[PDB]
Amino acid sequence: FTGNITTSYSHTTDNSTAVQDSNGESWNTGLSINKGESAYINANVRYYN
Amino acid sequence: FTGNITTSYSHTTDNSTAVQDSNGESWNTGLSINKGESAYINANVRYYN
Known part of the structure; x- marks a missing residue:
């Protein structure tokens, strides 16, 4: 008869960058x-006599 | 003949920030x-006699 208890803690740090270029035409x-x-x-018109 | 039952609970907290800069031209x-x-x-025009 086996048992187990687990406690875990996690920390995450994230950095991101993005560049977007757009071109459009209209008529x-x-x-x-x-x-x-x-x-x-x-x-x-013309006149007559 | 082995068996196992597992129950788990998880809680996640997240905070984020973002800054965007945009430049555009139009013609x-x-x-x-x-x-x-x-x-x-x-x-x-010219007149004649």
Whole structure:
């Protein structure tokens, strides 16, 4: 009939370093319109007599 | 014929610190145009008699 009791203690010290490099590109397109004055009209006309 | 039963208990305490430094650069270019008035025209003219 065997038995055993164990007690343990541990201490850990850690140091770390890190370097990150990032590059990115972006492309946007946009379109806006006014609902009051949306377009202009030109009329080609001739007079008669 | 041997046998064994083991029971264990563990407790861990941890503290950490970290410092991060970041530097970044950015460059943008943009071009916009109006589809109603896109350009202006100048005409070099002369009169004759």
